[PDB]
Amino acid sequence: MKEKVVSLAQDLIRRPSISPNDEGCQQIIAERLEKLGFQIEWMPFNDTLNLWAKHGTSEPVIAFAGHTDVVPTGDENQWSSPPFSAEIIDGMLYGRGAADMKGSLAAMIVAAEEYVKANPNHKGTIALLITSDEEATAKDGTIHVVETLMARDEKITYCMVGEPSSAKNLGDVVKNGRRGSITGNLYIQGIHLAENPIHKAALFLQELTTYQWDKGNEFFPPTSLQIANIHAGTGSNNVIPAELYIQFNLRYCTEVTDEIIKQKVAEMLEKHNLKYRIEWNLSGKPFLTKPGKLLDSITSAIEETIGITPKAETGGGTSDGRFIALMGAEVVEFGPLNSTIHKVNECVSVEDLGKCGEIYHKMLVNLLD
């Protein structure tokens, strides 16, 4: 599997897919999958390309998720190997996206291809969910795919996000949780003395910024809140404003839900007698994948392939996992060393990419058979 993985990784690295421009990465991938009888669906939105490709006719649905976009290179003259050459030196594959995450994307694709080729009538559904914008504004990427699937009640049961998870040695870390994000765009209307609506708003703001959402848990720090924006008045003096806008964001853990958060904020506003409107913008749900089928399939795949037991951690780097978690899928993340991601001279071990393909493949085996 090494050479297949490496060859696909180089192919992708050679395509300079700075977000959100895919530069034909997904076209190469769809061409190899379609050839093997995967059903291909394109889900573009604005300037972002998204691919949803699947093989199978039943549950469980196992999605491999990743992105073809890469961050900018910076000064290409400060690279020892040109960033889109995909040079291999001393078993190290150099290039922007080598680690984050074209090498592990290639490994997930090759693993999926080999499993399907070997088992044309396999149980469940093996899917790839590939976006061209994880790294930038990312409003039109995985979130678009997930809203499309949800709109038509299509399910994903399990998801492996192939973001580079490993800290010091291949296999040493699997990510098994991420925080959610929700933004409140609050508009307080209508703005004797204690009845002033700016006073009632300030009463609200004081309760909001000292309310204890949770203490967190063993796996997450406590839910945090940011007041991102306060705006009343158009800039004219001696004119009382009609509206007071407050934008706040929570990065939240599994101790609370979007519904608890919405309800607490509604209660607080009612308690302080405020009239208002609010537009809520949910940017993903937290997840925490506990011991079970999904965590065990990837843990055992790593143990049996390279003889290391991963530690399960939450957070660190970024991923689209919280978007996928919006659908109720159970999510984990695994892939190669992340120390060089987003830096000059990004690289990845070619041997590790071969082992990653074996690992992804064995996870499919463990999760279906």
Residues involved in catalysis:
69, 134
Minimum CB distance to a second copy, residue 211 (Å): 8
Residue 163 annotated as part of some ligand binding site: yes
140 binds Zn ion (CB under 5 A): no
| Near a second copy by CB under 8 A: residue from 39, 119, 148, 183 | 183
**Which one of a second copy, Zn ion, none interacts with residue 101, CB within 5 to 8 A by kind?**
Zn ion
Contact of 229 with 279, CB cutoff 8 Å: no
101 binds Zn ion (CB under 5 A): yes
Q: Which range of residues in 128-136, 152-160, 208-216, 357-365 is near a second copy by CB under 8 A? A: 208-216
**Dihedral sign, CA of 189, 192, 195, 199?**
positive
79-86 LR contacts (CB < 8 Å, sep 24+): 79/344, 79/345, 80/345, 81/345, 81/347, 83/346, 84/13, 84/14, 84/15, 84/16, 85/13, 85/14, 86/9, 86/10, 86/13, 86/14
What H or E segment, with its residue span, contains residue 175? strand 173-178
239 binds a second copy (CB under 8 A): yes
Site string for Zn ion, 149-188 (x = CB under 5 A): --------------x-------------------------
| Near a second copy by CB under 8 A: residue from 57, 228, 266, 275 | 228
Amino acid code (one letter) for 48: T
Task: Take residue 261 and report the two structure tokens written for it.
Answer: 């958060």
235 binds a second copy (CB under 8 A): yes
Query: Is beta strand 88-89 parallel, antiparallel or unpaired with respect to 92-94?
Result: antiparallel
Task: Kindly state the DSSP code that residue 245 receives in the 8-state scheme.
Answer: E
| Near a second copy by CB under 8 A: residue from 78, 85, 169, 209 | 209
Chain breaks after residues in the chain, where C lies over 2.5 Å from next N? 191
Minimum CB distance to a second copy, residue 80 (Å): 32
Q: Rounded to whole angstroms, how far apart are CA atoms 169 and 151?
A: 40
136 binds a second copy (CB under 8 A): no
**Dihedral sign, CA of 81, 84, 88, 92?**
positive
Task: Take residue 213 and report the two structure tokens written for it.
Answer: 């959402």
Minimum CB distance to a second copy, residue 178 (Å): 15
User: Does residue 160 have a cis bond before it (omega within 30 degrees)?
Assistant: no
| Near a second copy by CB under 8 A: residue from 39, 119, 217, 247 | 247
Residue 67 annotated as part of some ligand binding site: yes
**Which one of Zn ion, a second copy, none interacts with residue 227, CB within 5 to 8 A by kind?**
a second copy
Q: Which range of residues in 80-88, 172-180, 193-201, 330-338 is near a second copy by CB under 8 A? A: 193-201
110 binds Zn ion (CB under 5 A): no
100 binds Zn ion (CB under 5 A): yes
Give whichever of 39 and 318 is closer to a second copy, judged by the CB atom.
318
309 binds a second copy (CB under 8 A): no
Residue 100 annotated as part of some ligand binding site: yes
Site string for a second copy, 100-119 (x = CB under 8 A): --------------------
Minimum CB distance to a second copy, residue 130 (Å): 23
**Residues 325-343: b if buried by 16+ CB within 10 A, e if exposed:** bbbebbbbbbbbbbebbbe
Minimum CB distance to a second copy, residue 184 (Å): 11
145-153 LR contacts (CB < 8 Å, sep 24+): 145/43, 145/50, 145/52, 146/323, 146/324, 146/326, 146/327, 148/43, 148/52, 149/52, 149/327, 150/326, 150/327
Q: Kindly report the three-state secondary structure assignment for every residue of 293-308.
A: HHHHHHHHHHHHHHCC
Interface with a second copy (CB under 8 A): 183, 191, 193-194, 196, 198-199, 202-203, 205-206, 209-212, 222, 226-241, 244, 247, 249
Q: Which residues bind Zn ion (CB under 5 A)?
A: 100-101, 163
Positions at the binding site for Zn(2+): 67, 100, 135, 163, 342
